[PDB]
């Protein structure tokens, strides 16, 4: 199917407690594959998936150089942003950046990204054209002017249409055992009385990969998404994910209700019911 590669970066200033902490992770789809933390002893980018371990010493060296350079750039950006927002040097602030690419089943570029948040709010983003920017405010407009003058988008475009796609293709082949395997959910339905006249039906999905899934409850065929409690999809810690969906129903009307499960790993979508 379709795939993505994303690099995530967070810098968090901590006045009086040294330089900002910098943490960056790389993903292919929902699989973590590299990490760098500036607070590690003598920090290096480290592998986190088996299929990247085969990259040579030169790969780790270049990646490590890039991570350290990005940390320094983000330190300068954080000092810049204090100026742009007229802020004191006393508080902790946060700079986030995600960049990467989406590709289709045929490996062709679907979309590229390069976007930033300051203190949890949109700051600047590369538009889908990979040629222009959206600035969230007058501060980000200053960055936009600078990056336009420097033709920074041209460099981003070349990377996103070239190396981003090409290296994603390489990782997908090298990791084809896992990255190109969808593990279906293991499912069941639990029943919990609330009161004399109501009960909770909970539909469970466990052990699935990737995280994309649809869990819905129907009453005699009618979607009940208005009344369905859907927890956030959560990591199991072994690459897989978990999720549940619950509906409160009238006692003795449980057989009206079906849970419907759609996932890439399933031979067919499931229709489940409470089985006494």
């Amino acid at each position: 199917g379709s795939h993505s590669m994303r690099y995530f970066h967070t810098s968090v200033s901590r006045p009086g407690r040294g330089e900002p902490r910098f943490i960056t992770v790389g993903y292919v789809d929902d699989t973590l594959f590299v990490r760098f933390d500036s607070d590690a002893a003598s920090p290096r980018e480290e592998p986190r998936a088996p299929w990247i371990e085969q990259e040579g010493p030169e790969y780790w060296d270049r990646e490590t150089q890039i991570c350290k350079a990005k940390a320094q750039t983000d330190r300068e950006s954080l000092r810049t942003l204090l100026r742009y927002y007229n802020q004191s040097e006393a508080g902790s602030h946060t700079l986030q950046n995600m960049y990467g690419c989406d590709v289709g089943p045929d490996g062709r570029l679907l979309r590229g990204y390069d976007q930033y948040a300051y203190d949890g709010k949109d700051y600047i983003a590369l538009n889908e054209d990979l040629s222009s920017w959206t600035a969230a405010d007058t501060a980000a407009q200053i960055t936009q002017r600078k990056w336009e003058a420097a033709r920074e988008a041209e460099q981003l475009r070349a990377y996103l249409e070239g190396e981003c796609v090409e290296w994603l293709r390489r990782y997908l082949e090298n990791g084809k055992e896992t990255l190109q395997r969808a593990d279906p959910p293991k499912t069941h339905v639990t029943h919990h009385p609330i009161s004399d006249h109501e009960a909770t039906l909970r539909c469970w999905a466990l052990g699935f990969y990737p995280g994309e899934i649809t869990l819905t409850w129907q009453r005699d065929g009618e979607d009940q998404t208005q009344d369905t409690e859907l927890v956030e999809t959560r990591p199991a810690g072994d690459r897989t994910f978990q999720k549940w969906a619950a509906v409160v129903v009238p006692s003795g009307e449980e057989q009206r209700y079906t849970c419907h499960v759609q996932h890439e790993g399933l031979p067919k979508p499931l229709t489940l019911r409470w089985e006494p």
Binding site: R62, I66, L81, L95, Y116, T143, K146, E152, Y159, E163
Partner: peptide, 9 residues
């Protein structure tokens, strides 16, 4: 792999 170049804000 990561992009080599960038610029500060």
């Amino acid at each position: 792999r990561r992009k080599w170049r960038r610029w500060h804000l």
